[PDB]
Amino acid sequence: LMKIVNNAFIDLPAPSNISSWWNFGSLLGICLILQILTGLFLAMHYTSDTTTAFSSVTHICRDVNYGWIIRYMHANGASMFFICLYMHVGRGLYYGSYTFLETWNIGVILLLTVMATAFMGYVLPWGQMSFWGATVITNLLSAIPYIGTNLVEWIWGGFSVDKATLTRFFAFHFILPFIIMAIAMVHLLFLHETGSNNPTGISSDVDKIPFHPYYTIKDILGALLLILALMLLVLFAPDLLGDPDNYTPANPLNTPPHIKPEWYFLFAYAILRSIPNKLGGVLALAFSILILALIPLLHTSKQRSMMFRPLSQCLFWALVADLLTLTWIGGQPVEHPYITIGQLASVLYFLLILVLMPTAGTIENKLLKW
Amino acid sequence: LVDPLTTVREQCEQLEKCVKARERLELCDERVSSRSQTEEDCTEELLDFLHARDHCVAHKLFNSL
Amino acid sequence: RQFGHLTRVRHVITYSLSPFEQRAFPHYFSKGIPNVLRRTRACILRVAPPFVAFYLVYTWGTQEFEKSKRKN
Amino acid sequence: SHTDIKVPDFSDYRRPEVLDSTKSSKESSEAR
Amino acid sequence: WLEGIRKWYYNAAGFNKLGLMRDDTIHENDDVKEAIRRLPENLYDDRVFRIKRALDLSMRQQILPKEQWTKYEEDKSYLEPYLKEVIRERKEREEWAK
Amino acid sequence: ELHPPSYPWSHRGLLSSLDHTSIRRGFQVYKQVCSSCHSMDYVAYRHLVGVCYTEDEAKALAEEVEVQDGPNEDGEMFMRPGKLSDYFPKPYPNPEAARAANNGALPPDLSYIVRARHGGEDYVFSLLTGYCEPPTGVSLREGLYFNPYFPGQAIGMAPPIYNEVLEFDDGTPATMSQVAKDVCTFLRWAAEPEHDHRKRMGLKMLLMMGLLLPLVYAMKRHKWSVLKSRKLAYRPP
Amino acid sequence: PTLTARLYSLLFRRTSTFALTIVVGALFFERAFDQGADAIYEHINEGKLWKHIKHKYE
Numbered sequence A: 001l002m003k004i005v006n007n008a009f010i011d012l013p014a015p016s017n018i019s020s021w022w023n024f025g026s027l028l029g030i031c032l033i034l035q036i037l038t039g040l041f042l043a044m045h046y047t048s049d050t051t052t053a054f055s056s057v058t059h060i061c062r063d064v065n066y067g068w069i070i071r072y073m074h075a076n077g078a079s080m081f082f083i084c085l086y087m088h089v090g091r092g093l094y095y096g097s098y099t100f101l102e103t104w105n106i107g108v109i110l111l112l113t114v115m116a117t118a119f120m121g122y123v124l125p126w127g128q129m130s131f132w133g134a135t136v137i138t139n140l141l142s143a144i145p146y147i148g149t150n151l152v153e154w155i156w157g158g159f160s161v162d163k164a165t166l167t168r169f170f171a172f173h174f175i176l177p178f179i180i181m182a183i184a185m186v187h188l189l190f191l192h193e194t195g196s197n198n199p200t201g202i203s204s205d206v207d208k209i210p211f212h213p214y215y216t217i218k219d220i221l222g223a224l225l226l227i228l229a230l231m232l233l234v235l236f237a238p239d240l241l242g243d244p245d246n247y248t249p250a251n252p253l254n255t256p257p258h259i260k261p262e263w264y265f266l267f268a269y270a271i272l273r274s275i276p277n278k279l280g281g282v283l284a285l286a287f288s289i290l291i292l293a294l295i296p297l298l299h300t301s302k303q304r305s306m307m308f309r310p311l312s313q314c315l316f317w318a319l320v321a322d323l324l325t326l327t328w329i330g331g332q333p334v335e336h337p338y339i340t341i342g343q344l345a346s347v348l349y350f351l352l353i354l355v356l357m358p359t360a361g362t363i364e365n366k367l368l369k370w
Numbered sequence B: 001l002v003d004p005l006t007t008v009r010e011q012c013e014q015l016e017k018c019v020k021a022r023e024r025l026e027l028c029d030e031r032v033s034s035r036s037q038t039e040e041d042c043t044e045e046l047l048d049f050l051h052a053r054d055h056c057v058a059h060k061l062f063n064s065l
Numbered sequence C: 001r002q003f004g005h006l007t008r009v010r011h012v013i014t015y016s017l018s019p020f021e022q023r024a025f026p027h028y029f030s031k032g033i034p035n036v037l038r039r040t041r042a043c044i045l046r047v048a049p050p051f052v053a054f055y056l057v058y059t060w061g062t063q064e065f066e067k068s069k070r071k072n
Numbered sequence D: 001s002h003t004d005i006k007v008p009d010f011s012d013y014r015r016p017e018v019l020d021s022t023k024s025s026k027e028s029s030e031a032r
Numbered sequence E: 001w002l003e004g005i006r007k008w009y010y011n012a013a014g015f016n017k018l019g020l021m022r023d024d025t026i027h028e029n030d031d032v033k034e035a036i037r038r039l040p041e042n043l044y045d046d047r048v049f050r051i052k053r054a055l056d057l058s059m060r061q062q063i064l065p066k067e068q069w070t071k072y073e074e075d076k077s078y079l080e081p082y083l084k085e086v087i088r089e090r091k092e093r094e095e096w097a098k
Numbered sequence F: 001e002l003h004p005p006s007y008p009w010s011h012r013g014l015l016s017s018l019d020h021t022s023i024r025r026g027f028q029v030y031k032q033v034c035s036s037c038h039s040m041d042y043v044a045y046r047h048l049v050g051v052c053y054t055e056d057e058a059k060a061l062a063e064e065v066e067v068q069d070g071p072n073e074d075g076e077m078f079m080r081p082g083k084l085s086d087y088f089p090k091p092y093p094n095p096e097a098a099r100a101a102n103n104g105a106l107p108p109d110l111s112y113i114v115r116a117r118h119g120g121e122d123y124v125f126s127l128l129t130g131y132c133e134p135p136t137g138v139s140l141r142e143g144l145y146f147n148p149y150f151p152g153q154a155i156g157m158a159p160p161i162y163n164e165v166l167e168f169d170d171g172t173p174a175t176m177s178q179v180a181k182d183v184c185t186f187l188r189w190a191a192e193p194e195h196d197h198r199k200r201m202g203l204k205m206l207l208m209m210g211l212l213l214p215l216v217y218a219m220k221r222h223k224w225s226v227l228k229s230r231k232l233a234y235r236p237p
Numbered sequence G: 001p002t003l004t005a006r007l008y009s010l011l012f013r014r015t016s017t018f019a020l021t022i023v024v025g026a027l028f029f030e031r032a033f034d035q036g037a038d039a040i041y042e043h044i045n046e047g048k049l050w051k052h053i054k055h056k057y058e
Ligand code: HEC
Pocket: F029, F033, F034, F037, F038, F102, F105, F106, F107, F108, F110, F113, F124, F127, F128, F150, F154, F155, F156, F157, F158, F159, F160, F161, F183
């Protein structure tokens, strides 16, 4: 009598109209379980020490029987694991699922719990962009008054990134996914009290359907296509999203030309490089994420979806462009054309979310005599 | 011995973009050479020439190797 | 929650066939295609223009970035 | 009433083997 | 003129293209469910069909012909008379506490 | 800077492999030119087996160079002929001796140089094959030479190769280009020995995924077919 | 009748028989697919692989 719990996988009421956008919730359940198996088999041959880590990856990629595929099913198994989110989130914002506050506020807590885990995971190969990535990004906490000089040295276990900084990331990294797996079952738990949303935003109690033959096979399809776009990168462009300077071991006395995190952080980084004031830059960085927790308190339209909200559609897809911009600016260096652009886009990100998109639904209500 | 690379470059140098990038390279050369006590050089003028030539060498060279 | 008492419905009828008794690809090209174009025109003017705007600031910012690094 | 209830045409979607109302579907169920 | 603008926005939204009315779309909410519960059976049982039909369309990613689309002038506000009543009751409960 | 040009390498294809015959030539380059001044720590003579050298040929080369191995029972360390398990011998004992022997400059390792430089092998061939005098107005310090394909166009890498700088075994003419082609082919094997086995799985995948995607897409539109074809009506009293 | 109907009557009817087909299919599929796949790759990369040149060095 576990399998009363499998009714959430078999006899679960679910709507009928939901298109591919909802599959991205399940796929994380695959990427996560996929990534754990791969990263585990990397642990068998990884060493957490600085004199042996970078080589340890080589032991995998060279001497091991198919050790190399696992590295790239796993690194790029994180990249695809964030294409899935950002679309899994955009659904929740565009189709207005954030009214399930209990889930959404936990959706945030999964995001942060992850997007620090990749940061730790990117260190472990112990190359330049690994080291220098962590060197820059930890120092941002130094901007805080009265604490930062103490907290950063504590996280480092010293006065600069070194051995004990590495070894603890490996332990903070190879644990949190087992904490993330818990919060997912939690995250679903509050969802299975309410049942999922549809493109319309309307109560779908009338046209529910089971889950066992219909969405299962739909998830088998959607999972299959995911394994394509992953393995293509593994089998046709593995260094694509990477950064080749990583394949030089760490040299703390030789700074690389372009320091940057990987593509999935960069929109955050561009916001930071926009502001000259260091501390004020930080609170913008953390706020670019946490602002998701301010969305439902800024809901204004008496409708839920955006299939039936024209002005918000135009603003929504504008926000996506602002993101894509910030992804691009962060990857590119800091000069007078790109500085100016990076400033404008960052202002749009906060402006568009807080002001226009609420303002729209207010206007949209007025046209409908509300 | 003959490096075929020299032949392929020799043909690509005759192309329009190369001749025109060659031109400014000659013109800047006259400038900096005729002048004195200046920091300007023909670095950029050279690279534009070489970006053009070597792009032409790309399409042909390995046919000989 | 479960089936059976989710809500209340009255005087509604559903008809359905067995999948072994109907094609899985009926009018897949014959009718599906214009639905896509209909589904396309219905929304494309709301998706395109910010990404259209992106491609321009991408190039203009790119070219101006290049020109900045060249010379007087 | 209930007798006035009748099924509409699915023949746009039905398989070609089963478009003849006058024939028994069993003969091609094995193939379907 | 604004009336013409209200009309264009209505067709732009497109819930006429699924045969729905306005009040069929409003966010499920405590003040609303109260109002829905007070509906009569005729009007209610019509609401359910306007919805369940529409969901059957969005599943197929189709719509209805222009002849069945909801017209702007025919957009019945069947729920507002009952809803504005409920919200009035709520403000009395709040005002009574104060 | 200078964006290098992209070439028609034999292995640029999504299913194209490496010219293993060229990898044979490329190793002879690294061994007679660069192995005196560059390290390659993450390769063994055994990895060459079955790719460009065979067992015996590589084994013979293991016995050409001496390697420091074995705490003697007397309590000392000696030199022996290398074996296949041994890695490529590092020319220098430590990077400071390298900076000492190259005017403060550091010859980099070359295990991952392909995949550690933007542009990849296209860069490298253009780098060796891009030497020229500086233009007017440009002047460099002693030891350092000019090359447009480097940031700042200033490196300590004096000419490693030129026409008949060496000789090949297969009777190939050793033009500077022929040399730089083969070596870059070797390095792409070093930084990515899985390359030739990568694509075979890439081939097996697309053939399977060419099949499973439509078939699964049928079972979907087989089971959902009930719902894409259902109908509704409204019969109030 | 058609072949599809004959296949169902013998194989896809009993789930026990059904499964044994799939294993049997996998074996001959595993063999056939690998042979055909390699042939294409070699045909593309003809004269570039070790064995294609290995004969010269024995
Ligand atoms: C005469 C000693 C010497 C030989 C021979 C030599 N190198 Fe170099 N190389 C150096 C030194 C010293 C540097 C350091 C350049 C610098 O510090 O800017 C260098 C730099 C390089 C670079 C550029 C590194 C970068 O980040 O841009 C590459 C690539 C390289 N070596 C590989 C090669 C190749 C390819 C060859 C010819 C097949 C070769 N080495 C032969 C000494 C040598």
